């Protein structure tokens, strides 16, 4: 799966973090992003933890900080950033 | 190179009306456009992020809308701490670009300038120079023209103009015009005229002096 | 909680180089992108570029391709911006900002003046001619600033001290005071010009011309 975003929900976590449509996640917390499932599980499990993202906007790197919104979940407090993945 | 065009550059509003600042672009920046407020002699302040999303710190009266290649920043009830420069910055592509800037000034009943003229002093004439001074204090709006006449003939060289910021009391402007010449060329003409054309009068306010 | 301490004001000779700082306080300095913006007096903002601390990647505007050089130090938590081959067009206020998309936290502002003029004491000239208006012309001083008061600050109202214009690589400044026609010339109206850069303090009393 291509680690590109399609849209960012307004007034969400990825909105205040600076993420935009077309941005490509490259690194998360230092280590590169080879599996999109790792970033998905990091956004899911961590509910209010600062995640350092190295993205490539327009082909150029940029450093942002993402703080997932603690969306209510039955099992446990879940993390929602408001990112729409790339349409397959 | 996305060129943000911020029109118009200056808008005068009575402290209490609404304001809709425009910021047209040249390419599709989608909703990647943010607004900044810069008060005089200060640093910019982040107001609205991504066209309409509000920030945690700005009052409720600051909002905005728009998408693609047309944006608008809305201020509801303008307080006194809202005047100054406003800029729009896009973050869609490279390189990042700001707007041309929109100045928010306070509106005032059209006042006429208090024109005064002053000839050079003997102190300056000792060193070999001669500066004629023309003060235009307390007028509105800032838009005003001034011209220097030497024995009836307009002069363009040597003129230095300086405008003040909008006063915090009467909310008017003031201008200083200095015609700097050498003592020699000052000692070759008699009549020196400073004439100011302003919106308040259809005829210029003229202040002149003869050397003797 | 989050502050950007910028370097103090700077004067530079034409052709030299400067290197200003921007110490960040109150956040993880390596995760947020630093931004540098230029602003000439009275004009719009101008995006110089950005840098990613930790990775060292710096991306400048095409105009600031080689004029600006962006560096970052993680330990000192400070981003430096260097300007080489300085000209008169480099005199401006430079800001550093936080985040990589929108600029949330801004700095104070580093004012750079590029000139070759030496420190020059000012020349004070009196300006004499209902209500009367008197003036005080401060011509040929360097550098900024100059504080102009009237009657040791007593004449607080009706005073218009105009901004400084550059003339002959020096600074010229006018100041006007407006007093009733009874408080002059039957009273004392003095403009106190203070140029601390040259340790000069002039007190010029306005008298009617002879």
mmCIF file of N, CA and C in Angstrom, chain C residues 24-125:
data_model
loop_
_atom_site.group_PDB
_atom_site.id
_atom_site.type_symbol
_atom_site.label_atom_id
_atom_site.label_comp_id
_atom_site.label_asym_id
_atom_site.label_seq_id
_atom_site.Cartn_x
_atom_site.Cartn_y
_atom_site.Cartn_z
ATOM 1 N N UNK C 24 15.072 27.750 20.522
ATOM 2 C CA UNK C 24 13.710 27.324 20.811
ATOM 3 C C UNK C 24 13.613 26.795 22.235
ATOM 4 N N UNK C 25 12.527 27.151 22.921
ATOM 5 C CA UNK C 25 12.332 26.770 24.315
ATOM 6 C C UNK C 25 10.911 26.267 24.510
ATOM 7 N N UNK C 26 10.778 25.055 25.029
ATOM 8 C CA UNK C 26 9.502 24.529 25.452
ATOM 9 C C UNK C 26 8.886 23.419 24.614
ATOM 10 N N UNK C 27 9.672 22.710 23.806
ATOM 11 C CA UNK C 27 9.143 21.603 23.019
ATOM 12 C C UNK C 27 10.303 20.762 22.505
ATOM 13 N N UNK C 28 9.959 19.610 21.934
ATOM 14 C CA UNK C 28 10.938 18.727 21.305
ATOM 15 C C UNK C 28 11.467 19.406 20.048
ATOM 16 N N UNK C 29 12.692 19.930 20.135
ATOM 17 C CA UNK C 29 13.256 20.747 19.067
ATOM 18 C C UNK C 29 13.498 19.964 17.782
ATOM 19 N N UNK C 30 13.657 18.644 17.865
ATOM 20 C CA UNK C 30 14.014 17.839 16.704
ATOM 21 C C UNK C 30 12.816 17.391 15.874
ATOM 22 N N UNK C 31 11.593 17.509 16.394
ATOM 23 C CA UNK C 31 10.420 17.008 15.689
ATOM 24 C C UNK C 31 9.676 18.077 14.899
ATOM 25 N N UNK C 32 9.903 19.355 15.187
ATOM 26 C CA UNK C 32 9.231 20.448 14.499
ATOM 27 C C UNK C 32 10.199 21.139 13.547
ATOM 28 N N UNK C 33 9.681 21.563 12.397
ATOM 29 C CA UNK C 33 10.493 22.218 11.381
ATOM 30 C C UNK C 33 10.618 23.708 11.681
ATOM 31 N N UNK C 34 11.835 24.236 11.575
ATOM 32 C CA UNK C 34 12.064 25.663 11.749
ATOM 33 C C UNK C 34 11.906 26.375 10.412
ATOM 34 N N UNK C 35 11.362 27.589 10.457
ATOM 35 C CA UNK C 35 11.107 28.378 9.261
ATOM 36 C C UNK C 35 11.737 29.752 9.422
ATOM 37 N N UNK C 36 12.245 30.301 8.323
ATOM 38 C CA UNK C 36 12.857 31.621 8.316
ATOM 39 C C UNK C 36 12.173 32.481 7.266
ATOM 40 N N UNK C 37 11.751 33.679 7.683
ATOM 41 C CA UNK C 37 10.988 34.611 6.861
ATOM 42 C C UNK C 37 11.641 35.986 6.946
ATOM 43 N N UNK C 38 11.633 36.712 5.829
ATOM 44 C CA UNK C 38 12.203 38.048 5.727
ATOM 45 C C UNK C 38 11.091 39.077 5.561
ATOM 46 N N UNK C 39 11.321 40.283 6.083
ATOM 47 C CA UNK C 39 10.348 41.364 5.943
ATOM 48 C C UNK C 39 11.103 42.684 5.874
ATOM 49 N N UNK C 40 11.039 43.352 4.728
ATOM 50 C CA UNK C 40 11.624 44.680 4.658
ATOM 51 C C UNK C 40 10.651 45.713 5.226
ATOM 52 N N UNK C 41 11.171 46.810 5.800
ATOM 53 C CA UNK C 41 10.295 47.794 6.455
ATOM 54 C C UNK C 41 9.201 48.339 5.551
ATOM 55 N N UNK C 42 7.947 48.035 5.889
ATOM 56 C CA UNK C 42 6.804 48.531 5.157
ATOM 57 C C UNK C 42 6.282 47.617 4.069
ATOM 58 N N UNK C 43 6.980 46.528 3.764
ATOM 59 C CA UNK C 43 6.601 45.620 2.693
ATOM 60 C C UNK C 43 6.073 44.309 3.270
ATOM 61 N N UNK C 44 5.691 43.407 2.370
ATOM 62 C CA UNK C 44 5.075 42.148 2.754
ATOM 63 C C UNK C 44 6.129 41.141 3.209
ATOM 64 N N UNK C 45 5.651 40.048 3.798
ATOM 65 C CA UNK C 45 6.539 38.985 4.240
ATOM 66 C C UNK C 45 7.130 38.250 3.040
ATOM 67 N N UNK C 46 8.288 37.633 3.264
ATOM 68 C CA UNK C 46 9.007 36.924 2.213
ATOM 69 C C UNK C 46 9.593 35.653 2.804
ATOM 70 N N UNK C 47 9.135 34.504 2.313
ATOM 71 C CA UNK C 47 9.549 33.215 2.858
ATOM 72 C C UNK C 47 10.979 32.911 2.428
ATOM 73 N N UNK C 48 11.903 32.913 3.388
ATOM 74 C CA UNK C 48 13.290 32.571 3.087
ATOM 75 C C UNK C 48 13.439 31.068 2.898
ATOM 76 N N UNK C 49 13.016 30.288 3.887
ATOM 77 C CA UNK C 49 13.109 28.845 3.743
ATOM 78 C C UNK C 49 12.772 28.123 5.031
ATOM 79 N N UNK C 50 13.150 26.847 5.081
ATOM 80 C CA UNK C 50 12.905 26.033 6.262
ATOM 81 C C UNK C 50 14.040 25.034 6.438
ATOM 82 N N UNK C 51 14.076 24.428 7.624
ATOM 83 C CA UNK C 51 15.089 23.440 7.970
ATOM 84 C C UNK C 51 14.479 22.443 8.947
ATOM 85 N N UNK C 52 14.946 21.200 8.868
ATOM 86 C CA UNK C 52 14.509 20.144 9.773
ATOM 87 C C UNK C 52 15.622 19.837 10.763
ATOM 88 N N UNK C 53 15.510 20.261 12.021
ATOM 89 C CA UNK C 53 16.531 19.898 13.011
ATOM 90 C C UNK C 53 16.548 18.398 13.256
ATOM 91 N N UNK C 54 17.748 17.861 13.457
ATOM 92 C CA UNK C 54 17.912 16.432 13.624
ATOM 93 C C UNK C 54 18.373 15.763 12.346
ATOM 94 N N UNK C 55 17.716 16.089 11.234
ATOM 95 C CA UNK C 55 18.137 15.599 9.929
ATOM 96 C C UNK C 55 19.060 16.570 9.208
ATOM 97 N N UNK C 56 19.004 17.856 9.547
ATOM 98 C CA UNK C 56 19.840 18.853 8.917
ATOM 99 C C UNK C 56 19.406 19.279 7.533
ATOM 100 N N UNK C 57 18.308 18.736 7.014
ATOM 101 C CA UNK C 57 17.841 19.104 5.683
ATOM 102 C C UNK C 57 17.341 20.543 5.690
ATOM 103 N N UNK C 58 17.926 21.375 4.834
ATOM 104 C CA UNK C 58 17.524 22.765 4.681
ATOM 105 C C UNK C 58 17.061 22.988 3.250
ATOM 106 N N UNK C 59 15.912 23.642 3.095
ATOM 107 C CA UNK C 59 15.367 23.966 1.782
ATOM 108 C C UNK C 59 15.067 25.455 1.746
ATOM 109 N N UNK C 60 15.730 26.169 0.842
ATOM 110 C CA UNK C 60 15.606 27.612 0.725
ATOM 111 C C UNK C 60 14.803 27.979 -0.515
ATOM 112 N N UNK C 61 14.341 29.226 -0.539
ATOM 113 C CA UNK C 61 13.719 29.775 -1.731
ATOM 114 C C UNK C 61 14.765 29.935 -2.833
ATOM 115 N N UNK C 62 14.285 30.056 -4.073
ATOM 116 C CA UNK C 62 15.202 30.201 -5.199
ATOM 117 C C UNK C 62 15.960 31.522 -5.147
ATOM 118 N N UNK C 63 15.350 32.571 -4.591
ATOM 119 C CA UNK C 63 16.073 33.828 -4.424
ATOM 120 C C UNK C 63 17.128 33.705 -3.331
ATOM 121 N N UNK C 64 16.774 33.085 -2.208
ATOM 122 C CA UNK C 64 17.714 32.819 -1.121
ATOM 123 C C UNK C 64 18.463 31.510 -1.325
ATOM 124 N N UNK C 65 18.778 31.177 -2.580
ATOM 125 C CA UNK C 65 19.449 29.916 -2.881
ATOM 126 C C UNK C 65 20.820 29.849 -2.220
ATOM 127 N N UNK C 66 21.649 30.868 -2.441
ATOM 128 C CA UNK C 66 22.967 30.944 -1.831
ATOM 129 C C UNK C 66 23.140 32.136 -0.903
ATOM 130 N N UNK C 67 22.198 33.082 -0.893
ATOM 131 C CA UNK C 67 22.258 34.182 0.064
ATOM 132 C C UNK C 67 22.074 33.673 1.488
ATOM 133 N N UNK C 68 21.086 32.809 1.698
ATOM 134 C CA UNK C 68 20.780 32.268 3.014
ATOM 135 C C UNK C 68 21.363 30.869 3.162
ATOM 136 N N UNK C 69 21.863 30.575 4.359
ATOM 137 C CA UNK C 69 22.380 29.252 4.693
ATOM 138 C C UNK C 69 21.832 28.866 6.057
ATOM 139 N N UNK C 70 21.061 27.784 6.103
ATOM 140 C CA UNK C 70 20.356 27.370 7.308
ATOM 141 C C UNK C 70 21.086 26.204 7.961
ATOM 142 N N UNK C 71 21.343 26.322 9.263
ATOM 143 C CA UNK C 71 21.972 25.263 10.038
ATOM 144 C C UNK C 71 21.195 25.064 11.331
ATOM 145 N N UNK C 72 21.398 23.909 11.962
ATOM 146 C CA UNK C 72 20.693 23.582 13.193
ATOM 147 C C UNK C 72 21.609 22.806 14.126
ATOM 148 N N UNK C 73 21.461 23.050 15.428
ATOM 149 C CA UNK C 73 22.224 22.351 16.454
ATOM 150 C C UNK C 73 21.248 21.814 17.489
ATOM 151 N N UNK C 74 21.280 20.495 17.698
ATOM 152 C CA UNK C 74 20.295 19.848 18.559
ATOM 153 C C UNK C 74 20.595 20.094 20.032
ATOM 154 N N UNK C 75 21.867 19.983 20.425
ATOM 155 C CA UNK C 75 22.236 20.135 21.830
ATOM 156 C C UNK C 75 21.895 21.531 22.336
ATOM 157 N N UNK C 76 22.413 22.560 21.665
ATOM 158 C CA UNK C 76 22.053 23.928 22.011
ATOM 159 C C UNK C 76 20.616 24.265 21.638
ATOM 160 N N UNK C 77 19.942 23.395 20.878
ATOM 161 C CA UNK C 77 18.549 23.594 20.476
ATOM 162 C C UNK C 77 18.375 24.929 19.754
ATOM 163 N N UNK C 78 19.252 25.185 18.784
ATOM 164 C CA UNK C 78 19.301 26.498 18.153
ATOM 165 C C UNK C 78 19.466 26.357 16.648
ATOM 166 N N UNK C 79 18.658 27.102 15.899
ATOM 167 C CA UNK C 79 18.764 27.168 14.449
ATOM 168 C C UNK C 79 19.429 28.481 14.056
ATOM 169 N N UNK C 80 20.475 28.389 13.241
ATOM 170 C CA UNK C 80 21.224 29.546 12.778
ATOM 171 C C UNK C 80 20.921 29.816 11.312
ATOM 172 N N UNK C 81 20.887 31.095 10.958
ATOM 173 C CA UNK C 81 20.737 31.525 9.576
ATOM 174 C C UNK C 81 21.876 32.476 9.241
ATOM 175 N N UNK C 82 22.612 32.163 8.178
ATOM 176 C CA UNK C 82 23.762 32.944 7.750
ATOM 177 C C UNK C 82 23.458 33.633 6.428
ATOM 178 N N UNK C 83 23.785 34.918 6.356
ATOM 179 C CA UNK C 83 23.657 35.718 5.146
ATOM 180 C C UNK C 83 25.049 36.120 4.680
ATOM 181 N N UNK C 84 25.403 35.712 3.465
ATOM 182 C CA UNK C 84 26.682 36.033 2.854
ATOM 183 C C UNK C 84 26.482 37.027 1.717
ATOM 184 N N UNK C 85 27.549 37.763 1.410
ATOM 185 C CA UNK C 85 27.545 38.794 0.373
ATOM 186 C C UNK C 85 26.383 39.770 0.586
ATOM 187 N N UNK C 86 26.567 40.610 1.599
ATOM 188 C CA UNK C 86 25.533 41.524 2.055
ATOM 189 C C UNK C 86 25.531 42.800 1.226
ATOM 190 N N UNK C 87 24.333 43.245 0.858
ATOM 191 C CA UNK C 87 24.118 44.489 0.133
ATOM 192 C C UNK C 87 23.096 45.326 0.894
ATOM 193 N N UNK C 88 22.748 46.480 0.320
ATOM 194 C CA UNK C 88 21.790 47.367 0.971
ATOM 195 C C UNK C 88 20.399 46.748 1.038
ATOM 196 N N UNK C 89 20.080 45.836 0.117
ATOM 197 C CA UNK C 89 18.763 45.212 0.090
ATOM 198 C C UNK C 89 18.568 44.181 1.194
ATOM 199 N N UNK C 90 19.612 43.851 1.952
ATOM 200 C CA UNK C 90 19.497 42.886 3.036
ATOM 201 C C UNK C 90 19.027 43.506 4.346
ATOM 202 N N UNK C 91 18.910 44.830 4.415
ATOM 203 C CA UNK C 91 18.442 45.496 5.627
ATOM 204 C C UNK C 91 16.961 45.199 5.822
ATOM 205 N N UNK C 92 16.638 44.379 6.819
ATOM 206 C CA UNK C 92 15.262 43.932 7.014
ATOM 207 C C UNK C 92 15.153 43.233 8.361
ATOM 208 N N UNK C 93 13.918 42.910 8.741
ATOM 209 C CA UNK C 93 13.636 42.159 9.957
ATOM 210 C C UNK C 93 13.440 40.698 9.579
ATOM 211 N N UNK C 94 14.138 39.811 10.277
ATOM 212 C CA UNK C 94 14.108 38.383 10.000
ATOM 213 C C UNK C 94 13.459 37.658 11.170
ATOM 214 N N UNK C 95 12.466 36.827 10.865
ATOM 215 C CA UNK C 95 11.732 36.068 11.864
ATOM 216 C C UNK C 95 11.972 34.575 11.679
ATOM 217 N N UNK C 96 11.975 33.854 12.797
ATOM 218 C CA UNK C 96 11.931 32.402 12.793
ATOM 219 C C UNK C 96 10.595 31.936 13.358
ATOM 220 N N UNK C 97 10.093 30.837 12.803
ATOM 221 C CA UNK C 97 8.767 30.336 13.128
ATOM 222 C C UNK C 97 8.815 28.824 13.293
ATOM 223 N N UNK C 98 7.820 28.304 14.004
ATOM 224 C CA UNK C 98 7.720 26.890 14.332
ATOM 225 C C UNK C 98 6.751 26.189 13.383
ATOM 226 N N UNK C 99 6.834 24.854 13.370
ATOM 227 C CA UNK C 99 6.002 23.975 12.549
ATOM 228 C C UNK C 99 6.315 24.120 11.062
ATOM 229 N N UNK C 100 5.954 23.110 10.274
ATOM 230 C CA UNK C 100 6.345 23.059 8.878
ATOM 231 C C UNK C 100 5.267 23.447 7.886
ATOM 232 N N UNK C 101 4.003 23.388 8.302
ATOM 233 C CA UNK C 101 2.903 23.778 7.427
ATOM 234 C C UNK C 101 2.495 25.218 7.702
ATOM 235 N N UNK C 102 1.746 25.429 8.778
ATOM 236 C CA UNK C 102 1.383 26.759 9.238
ATOM 237 C C UNK C 102 2.315 27.181 10.366
ATOM 238 N N UNK C 103 2.588 28.481 10.437
ATOM 239 C CA UNK C 103 3.560 29.018 11.389
ATOM 240 C C UNK C 103 2.815 29.398 12.662
ATOM 241 N N UNK C 104 2.867 28.519 13.664
ATOM 242 C CA UNK C 104 2.101 28.732 14.888
ATOM 243 C C UNK C 104 2.818 29.680 15.845
ATOM 244 N N UNK C 105 4.046 29.343 16.229
ATOM 245 C CA UNK C 105 4.816 30.137 17.178
ATOM 246 C C UNK C 105 5.876 30.935 16.429
ATOM 247 N N UNK C 106 5.852 32.252 16.601
ATOM 248 C CA UNK C 106 6.798 33.157 15.968
ATOM 249 C C UNK C 106 7.788 33.689 16.997
ATOM 250 N N UNK C 107 8.862 34.288 16.491
ATOM 251 C CA UNK C 107 9.901 34.857 17.316
ATOM 252 C C UNK C 107 9.718 36.344 17.539
ATOM 253 N N UNK C 108 10.791 36.985 18.002
ATOM 254 C CA UNK C 108 10.787 38.416 18.277
ATOM 255 C C UNK C 108 11.133 39.238 17.039
ATOM 256 N N UNK C 109 12.223 38.891 16.361
ATOM 257 C CA UNK C 109 12.637 39.614 15.175
ATOM 258 C C UNK C 109 14.055 40.134 15.263
ATOM 259 N N UNK C 110 14.903 39.725 14.323
ATOM 260 C CA UNK C 110 16.283 40.191 14.254
ATOM 261 C C UNK C 110 16.391 41.230 13.145
ATOM 262 N N UNK C 111 16.701 42.468 13.517
ATOM 263 C CA UNK C 111 16.771 43.566 12.560
ATOM 264 C C UNK C 111 18.205 43.712 12.064
ATOM 265 N N UNK C 112 18.398 43.571 10.755
ATOM 266 C CA UNK C 112 19.711 43.647 10.129
ATOM 267 C C UNK C 112 19.803 44.936 9.326
ATOM 268 N N UNK C 113 20.815 45.747 9.633
ATOM 269 C CA UNK C 113 21.097 46.984 8.915
ATOM 270 C C UNK C 113 22.456 46.852 8.245
ATOM 271 N N UNK C 114 22.476 46.959 6.920
ATOM 272 C CA UNK C 114 23.697 46.825 6.135
ATOM 273 C C UNK C 114 24.089 48.212 5.648
ATOM 274 N N UNK C 115 25.127 48.780 6.259
ATOM 275 C CA UNK C 115 25.617 50.096 5.879
ATOM 276 C C UNK C 115 27.090 50.198 6.240
ATOM 277 N N UNK C 116 27.778 51.123 5.574
ATOM 278 C CA UNK C 116 29.193 51.366 5.810
ATOM 279 C C UNK C 116 29.454 52.667 6.555
ATOM 280 N N UNK C 117 28.408 53.385 6.954
ATOM 281 C CA UNK C 117 28.586 54.673 7.609
ATOM 282 C C UNK C 117 29.166 54.496 9.006
ATOM 283 N N UNK C 118 30.063 55.403 9.379
ATOM 284 C CA UNK C 118 30.619 55.411 10.721
ATOM 285 C C UNK C 118 29.666 56.110 11.685
ATOM 286 N N UNK C 119 29.899 55.893 12.977
ATOM 287 C CA UNK C 119 29.098 56.550 14.001
ATOM 288 C C UNK C 119 29.285 58.059 13.916
ATOM 289 N N UNK C 120 28.199 58.771 13.627
ATOM 290 C CA UNK C 120 28.237 60.204 13.405
ATOM 291 C C UNK C 120 27.294 60.913 14.368
ATOM 292 N N UNK C 121 27.766 61.920 15.106
ATOM 293 C CA UNK C 121 26.870 62.646 16.001
ATOM 294 C C UNK C 121 25.882 63.483 15.211
ATOM 295 N N UNK C 122 24.690 63.718 15.748
ATOM 296 C CA UNK C 122 23.668 64.452 15.000
ATOM 297 C C UNK C 122 23.901 65.955 15.022
ATOM 298 N N UNK C 123 23.297 66.622 14.042
ATOM 299 C CA UNK C 123 23.281 68.076 13.957
ATOM 300 C C UNK C 123 21.855 68.551 14.199
ATOM 301 N N UNK C 124 21.672 69.383 15.220
ATOM 302 C CA UNK C 124 20.354 69.863 15.621
ATOM 303 C C UNK C 124 20.166 71.279 15.098
ATOM 304 N N UNK C 125 19.079 71.496 14.360
ATOM 305 C CA UNK C 125 18.757 72.790 13.788
ATOM 306 C C UNK C 125 17.371 73.225 14.245
#
